[PDB]
Symmetry: C4
Subunit: 198 residues, 4 copies
């Protein structure tokens, strides 16, 4: 079975290579940034660990300030500086195996869809993880490479979801104690248009 159920206690958020250099070059970057912050804010509300990564941070900068300020509150965040395109460096793999072996569901955000996101996805699939690509929160230099990467990841087994669909999947019940604050986050997230909804 390939169902891609999402449980808060079995899930972890991945944010890939959202640097300041790629500002002004990524297709629909404001949507990518706004959507990723909604995921991060959701990660706090359902106690999801967050793994954040930077690619050649020396000559490409750090994570953009919009998400960096959001990440301060989150209880469990570890930031990895890498130069492998895939996020699954031995340090990240050890983090997942040593501190959260029961979490086999990865919610994947970041850029570029067809470079770091894709390679992270395939390595995660190789290691037996369920990969959930948040299509709202991934993009590339061109729209062509974003749409291609989504389908290329899909044909390898990755579930392609959205910010709202993933979050309501993790909520699973409006009668849960967290639903009221989940709804506020969703309502606030809807106040900005989706740049990919063409």
């Amino acid at each position: 079975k390939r169902l891609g159920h999402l449980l808060p206690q079995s899930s972890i958020l991945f944010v890939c290579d959202v640097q300041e250099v790629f500002r002004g070059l990524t297709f629909q970057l404001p949507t990518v940034i706004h959507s990723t912050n909604t995921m991060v804010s959701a990660a706090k509300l359902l106690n999801l660990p967050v793994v954040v990564t930077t690619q050649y941070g020396s000559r490409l900068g750090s994570t953009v300030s919009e998400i960096s300020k959001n990440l301060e509150n989150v209880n469990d965040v570890k930031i990895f500086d890498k130069m492998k395109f895939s996020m699954l460096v031995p340090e990240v793999e050890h983090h997942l195996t040593s501190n959260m072996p029961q979490r086999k569901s990865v919610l994947l955000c970041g850029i570029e869809t067809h470079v770091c996101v894709l390679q992270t996805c395939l390595d995660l699939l190789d290691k037996g993880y369920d990969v959930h690509v948040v299509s709202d929160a991934v993009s590339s230099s061109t729209s062509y490479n974003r749409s291609m990467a989504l389908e290329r990841m899909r044909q390898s087994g990755a579930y392609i979801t959205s910010v709202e669909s993933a979050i309501f999947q993790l909520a699973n019940d409006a009668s849960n104690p967290e639903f009221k604050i989940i709804s506020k986050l969703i309502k606030e997230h809807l106040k900005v248009g989706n740049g990919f909804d063409t």
Copy 2:
């Protein structure tokens, strides 16, 4: 094999959360209401049981009047009030197992594609059901989440059909004695356009 054949003896119609508060907010909701009503009228002709659900009725309202009026005439209908996003709440599942264990094909209509339709679809597939998503009878607040959700369900095994394709599948032969009145239903259904046809 993954054929998605539809037999009236082993089929059942699900109507998810088509409620008043979504009037004027959901993408092409009138097409959703009209297509769902055709499916409900079709279930009367082919004697399909109907399961209807409402999500937090005291805030989102009851089922829209057009569908609730059409549900008056159906022989086998039960309406459930629920807080879980998925329709497979224990009261609904108790109905399926204790009343119709032989019906393992679910025709799914309603809103939203990416929240309650999706989670119903995943849970139904978990229990060995065949899920046929009536694509022109499901929708979301944005077209983006609708299209994403349809492919997200198809990637898990759900069959993506339409009102005409699914109804003609159930009929299976124009020589059957029910085809004369099924034809009348299709002809009336075609008097209005498809809001998703662009």
Copy 3:
């Protein structure tokens, strides 16, 4: 493995209900007639048996004159009248089993994609046939139900091909004794534009 190779010795062309009633109801109908006629012409050059059907011919009319004229010179044709939406009526299925059991690759053309083409495709896949849907030569009353049906069939394993692609698969080698006449057919086919190429 699902390669969908096409060999003339094991292939047969199916033409589904291209009748006069639809000359006024079907999206991109002229392309459907033209592409189907190219398939019939190719069936003659490659010695492919052809199975044609009519749905309720007493009321819906016979095959369109453009195709019926082209069928006169075809060596192996058998035309069946049916009320069942699927083309795989017992009389048809007897013809395949008794007279050409070695041919398990079916080239599928006709209308409508979502009713009679799809139900034929599902029944053929049930009996172990490889189904090649000629997307160039199938359509519905609406573009929505054609595109839906194409993916709905592919999701079950049907190979979605085109008039040029299927023909050139069968004409494996340009050094074959058939290539010169096959080229004359393709150049004639390309003289009138593919209406689906939008």
Copy 4:
């Protein structure tokens, strides 16, 4: 697992029949030429063998001068003339078997998507190869047939990739010694508009 990892040591580049008569006939031919040249240069940098074919070369012409001149810089190139539409002629297959049996990943470029690229991909899949179609670097006479063939090949197990995505996963790591010249190659490639990005 259908991951489709790409390793330079086990990968080979195929260029299908980019000849001199298809100028003015192939949809977005300039993009196909530029994308293939980027692949050819990447093969040189990553020490990937290159196999080029021409179909009926005497009457269809040689490989286009843009790609022909670039092949002058690559040491490991083999150019063959063929009558068979598929690239897997015995001469080409013997070159693979007796000179690089360890390379079972193929990056596929050229024209036409639905005739020569497709049949090459099907034959390669039949022989246990991973086929990666560089969607950036394939096209047909019509947009319709290229789009069809891409999904017709993905449906059979081929990975649908792009020039940038395939190259970056071949490089695997930004700390590799060849990354600097690869980044220059990618930088030049990003400056050319994508004819299929619309």
